[model samples]
Target: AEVSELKLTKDNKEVVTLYANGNAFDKDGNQISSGTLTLTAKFKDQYGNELTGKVAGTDYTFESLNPEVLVVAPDGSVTPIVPGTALVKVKYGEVTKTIPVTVKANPVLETIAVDSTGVSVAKGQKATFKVTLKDQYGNKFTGNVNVTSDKTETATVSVSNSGIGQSEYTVTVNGVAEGSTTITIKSGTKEVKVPVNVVAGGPVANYQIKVLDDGKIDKSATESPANNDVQLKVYAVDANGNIVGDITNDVTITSEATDTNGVIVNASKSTANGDTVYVITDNGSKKVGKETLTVKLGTVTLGTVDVEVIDTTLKATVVTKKADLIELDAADNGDALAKLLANLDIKDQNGNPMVDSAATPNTNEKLQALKSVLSGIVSSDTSVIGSVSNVDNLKDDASISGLAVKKAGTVTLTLVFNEDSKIAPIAITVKAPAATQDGVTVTGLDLVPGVTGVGKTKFTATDKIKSGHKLYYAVDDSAVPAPAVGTTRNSTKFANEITVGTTEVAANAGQIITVIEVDSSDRVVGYKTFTVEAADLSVAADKTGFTATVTPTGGNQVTTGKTLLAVSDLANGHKLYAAAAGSSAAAAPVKGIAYTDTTVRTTYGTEVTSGTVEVDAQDGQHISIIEVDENGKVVGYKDYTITGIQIGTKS
Candidate 1:
């Protein structure tokens, strides 16, 4: 092509750029990051020649040597492709200038320790939750953060709001983990592991077993058999230590007996693998632990007995004349009678039975008497069978009679052979017929009055001193004083049928003399006590009227009830008070007798003279004073004026 003149501009500026080859257009007319553009000049010179290398204003042109990398993709932008520093420039013909540009990536994901794990608490419990946020360098960033949880929302978390009842929580730092940093959000976790267990607590209640005065078990017990016999109980508790309901039937119990040596010989089915616990009974608690026992295994035997006697002063008489009757008598006394023996039983200290049922005595006195039993043998053959003909005393090698009292009662007696004057004293235990308790005992004293002829005046007593108790039938010497207290007295004319007995007399006050209901062995199966009142006496006088009869009617004596006195009576020089009825000397009175001269005074039914009757604060309107002589006669009076008030009679 023929040489053609051309001009280029940016925003209409002249001479925008030039190529090193002096060519203005390339094949595509596009610029590349590797290409350089230079400006020859933008305007004409003063000589009218077009400026080639520079512009007059900024001293530069679009034709620059090192232009900024435009990151060309058919789009015009300075956005960097990769993160680094790059050069941007503008140039003209021979002049050039440049600046540095930098590119970076936006921040990505971030995290923080909002709350640290605290000590483990019970389900539904609370703990503290703290949070913090920071840049890589750990310097706190300023801004709010989001909060969330992996558990149910029970309590919202906040540094100011954390406390009891609130469970788990997550906290977020609003800004950074330091400086004026604050937790932006709060959340809590409440769902915890809560387990429920239905456990038994203590053992079932124990039963109260009563033994009546009658040697039988009290039948009035109406408690549950489970409680009375064996019952299940609770042991220890778990971590939660939650409480449980009183489920009676849920647990099972068993029972077994221990040997005399305290070794548990066997266990009952009620217990499981030796786990059946028992109620802490007073009887058992007193004892230490016994040997371990298994379900239903071992056993023990009951007890047995025997007897012996060695005496020859008394005789046992068995009567075949009418019926079976045994009478024991000391040598030839007109009346040689001991007490009746009835309802006897033998047992050990624990109160278990020792007799067999086949040998029980009949109710008849003859059959009940031990003398009668000996009499039968003597009547048959005195030589072949040693006759119990004489039984004197159990002293200094003297033979005593021995007997084996058992479940079925038995009796035996030794006679006295001394002369009436030389006879020794005898203590007699005249037992009434036996009463019975079904489960407890079969032989016991009858304490219920009507049952024993005492009406309801129960005198069921036990002994304080073994043989010092007594039951006396006072002599017809009804008008007589008690027998002369000496040991020996004339019993011939004495109507007293005193039977020396064994009974406990009350000892000290406030101390209970418990009447124990015993088994055959004298063991107290049950008991009761009477709170004997404190022995004291109080006396009161009505004083409604004192005798009006005069004393001698001659000399002046303390006329019959002449002066009123208190129940305690006044001493010499004691002041007597004139108070309202029922009022005592302890109370303040309107007037007082300053001196009660025991040196008798004459009667004052007739007044003689009167003195100045000036009433003052000391003497109210009715209060008065009087002067008397040794004979109790009122001579003169002062301030004795009566009150205007009327009482029973007019003032």
Candidate 2:
């Protein structure tokens, strides 16, 4: 029979029509077919994108148009039943395409192998299995793979296509418990079984410590008077005493010295394997005896070891000519021989004093010649005193090898005896001289410049102590008129005063007024200096009618409107007074006062050379800056006008 009717449908929808002679038709009722008969099965995914040879496939369907001539599988694969032409239909979702199938011999499954025969993993971990599939021609096939776990409760198996080839697949087996299981993977007529093993693990449960030094801290007699080091090894373990590996924890190890004669210094863990603890004598001098060294972790006592403190059997003593301590003034120097000495009883291998005792002239002569023999005296401050040695005779008196005074500080003189004598060093502290007193004193010497926008100035001088003394005053370097031998001037009383105006600022730009203290001998005991500083004024507007710039000659500018300007150029010792434009003094000059209720800025200090002054007034207005010497007497000032320079005005 000739090839008859051919129809194609995908996902319940008609796709194409085909004729018996291998002719294919589209929706337009037109016959379109490739004259070649071998089926060309082009596949695509649900989204309609064409699938390449490397893409995995599962949903494609193919059927034989004439069973006697051809056969088709669900994988869209065609096989020959006989040598003949036949139309086969391909289905995917709602889209279908047809191709002519020419019957030919079926391909045989040739080679099959798995990547791994057995897999092992810790519990809660996964292992992957890969299998290779090939056809009779040794060509790799790309298609669906089935993988299953024989013991699904103990492990789970999953499969995926590699897309590299239909014969390659990845199978993951997850171990859920501590046991072995098998995973079976199948492709076509071939199958692979992989074994899965899972093992158990546990957390650290306990720990222990061991003395690293074979359980003992041994010290020899000669090791006395020195620090002995001991260490302890730490170990982590599980409940059954097995080592718990692959983890870390913060372990605190502490040490204690349970004896008054011994001390523990720098006790801490220096390594993961152990901790180091040093045991030494309490005085750090001669070993005073033994100490029980205890090592612990929290409240658990790990171990206890005995530390022996040894002593050198030697007699030694140091004495100073200045009694217990060698004391000297800051500007004074001293003779070491008269200040300190070391009496040595050091012995030689023969059990006799190292120094000659009039028994051997040769050795005794040589001993007396050794200046620093039994004493090694050094000084911390060479400027105060250098090395000290026996100048008159060795084994007797010590003298300063170098002595010089530099400044006012403490100098430490240390005298160290010979090592064989086992004597501690003697320390003598030297102090420098103190500062002398300035006989006379004065108060109220700093005065500010300016008067209310106009010109007004006043200054005062007061005597505090030297009652019978008189005051000599002068401006700049002009010599002051001396007072009588016993009498004083009217202006030089306990409370005195001086006056100046805006015109005086020219001569007093940087000049200071001098006040001399004359004692009964007609000699000057002390003096005070007073300088007139120009007032740097500034003001800010407070949304008020007035705006002004309180400009100082050498610094940043200030403006009106909620901004503050710090005024510089005046001595803090002087009181700064402010008033409205063209106003007179407001109840004597004082510090920090408001000019108006709406706006005000003020500050006070016994000594304030510069400060911030907030002013609120109209533009082109005026304010007064007054300077008064500390005694409340006006010295100088300038009645200033509000300028148009904006300073610290807020936006």
Candidate number of the best TM-score: 2
- Compared with the true structure, the alpha-carbon lDDT of candidate 2 equals 0.45
Q: Least lDDT summed over 10 consecutive residues: which range in candidate 1?
A: 301-310
User: Candidate 1 on 1-79: residue-level lDDT in tens?
Assistant: 1112222322112322222322223223322232222221234444666555533335543322223422311111222
Error of 1 at 90 (Å): 99
Ten contiguous residues minimizing lDDT sum, candidate 2: 537-546
Q: TM-score of model 2 relative to the true fold?
A: 0.17
Residue 225 local lDDT, model 2: 23
- The C-alpha TM-scores of every prediction are 0.14, 0.17
Q: Mark the regions of model 2 whose C-alpha exceeds 4 Å error after superposition.
A: 1-104, 108-111, 161-166, 188-190, 200-651
Candidate 1: segments with Cα more than 4 A from true spot: 1-228, 234-236, 239-265, 269-651
Best-matching candidate per lDDT: 2
